[PDB]
Amino acid sequence: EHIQKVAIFGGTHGNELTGVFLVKHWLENGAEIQRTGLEVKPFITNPRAVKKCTRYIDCDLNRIFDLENLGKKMSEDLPYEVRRAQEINHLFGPKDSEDSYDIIFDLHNTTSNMGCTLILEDSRNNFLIQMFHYIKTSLAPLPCYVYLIEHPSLKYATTRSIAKYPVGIEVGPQPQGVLRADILDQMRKMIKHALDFIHHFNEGKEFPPCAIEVYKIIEKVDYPRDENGEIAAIIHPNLQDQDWKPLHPGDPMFLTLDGKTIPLGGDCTVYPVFVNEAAYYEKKEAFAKTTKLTLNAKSIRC
């Protein structure tokens, strides 16, 4: 059924600059992101954090789009981002209402070496699975991985979760507060292909069943802390930059300043992602342990 309202959000985290740059340019000339019979609105979600070139002002914008915050009485005392979440929800939602935007792409960067990443929230979601498959195939031979979040709560609080079909776009490695040409080119391409898909679907194109490989988070792995709770070992050079690649029971994982290796253990293979992400220091995380699985989509047709 016909897709009408599409947004591309940038600056959810103010120091992830690829999104900010694109959206700002598109707000002056949207030609690249328009499709015949499709309105795409670019929007900067966190202006204050973008001016300060900072992750957030008062709290993470990408973690509060839920009934607890979006439903509390509007007030000058409320943390900036809460205040902002309610504005965004009024513009592009209300979340869960039939009037809400159909598809939102929320753009993000990581310091991890992940390349092009799509983030999926519903594991049972044929339309989005189909889209991700289309993107994957278009980027080839450029790799493109799909990261799967499966809350047994069935609830999400991400900025994009306003949409009927939320799409997370993440590209790394890029230092925060830095704009790399290569990274910008990758994200552009992903967007170009995502919009091609929407457009083709709206033109009534048929899509046979398809399958994608996804990586589902099973555990946040923390750094070894010491007596005082301080980081006591660091990501081993062998693991560094090896996001998505298999890591076995034997393999090096941490290195201590005194020079010893701490190996994986457990007794099956895992797929580290978000290996050494800047934002995951404070929030105690060296990487995420993921399982690799296949999702299937039924054929779809508008």
Which residues does the annotation place in the binding site? 13, 16, 55, 62-63, 108, 156, 160, 280
Question: What b/e sequence results for 211-238 when a residue is b if at least 16 CB atoms lie within 10 Å of its CB, and e otherwise?
Answer: ebebbbbeeebebeeeeeeeebbbbbee
Q: Binding partner of residue 220 among Zn ion, a copy of itself, none, CB under 5 to 8 Å per kind?
A: none
Residue from 74, 154, 181, 268 that binds a copy of itself (CB under 8 A)? 181
Q: Is 113 helix (H, G, I), strand (E, B) or coil?
A: coil
Q: Which of 44, 78, 217, 231 binds a copy of itself (CB under 8 A)?
A: 231
Chain positions contacting Zn ion, by CB under 5 A: 13, 16, 108
Smaller CB separation from Zn ion, 16 or 243: 16
What are the start-end ranges of the H helices in the chain? Answer: 17-26, 47-51, 67-70, 80-92, 126-139, 181-202
Among residues 274, 263, 269, the alpha carbon closest in space to that of 240 is found at 274
Contacts to a copy of itself from residues 15-34, by CB under 8 A: 21-22, 24-25
Whole-number minimum distance, CB 67 to a copy of itself, in Å? 31
Q: Contact between 237 and a copy of itself (CB under 8 A)?
A: yes
Q: Which two tokens stand for residue 275?
A: 């290996």
Residue 170 a catalytic site member: yes
> 43: Cβ–Cβ under 8 A, 6 or more apart, which residues?
7, 8, 9, 10, 23, 91, 92
Of the candidate residues 125, 176, 202, 291, the single one contacting a copy of itself (CB under 8 A): 176
The side-by-side arrangement of strands in the sheet containing 261-263 is: 234-235, 252-255, 261-263
Q: Which stretch binds a copy of itself (CB under 8 A): 77-85, 88-96, 147-155, 276-284?
A: 276-284
Contact 224, 262 (CB under 8 A): yes
- Residue numbers of the site for a copy of itself (CB under 8 A)? 21-22, 24-25, 53, 111, 173-182, 184-185, 230-231, 234-237, 240, 255, 257, 276-279, 281-282
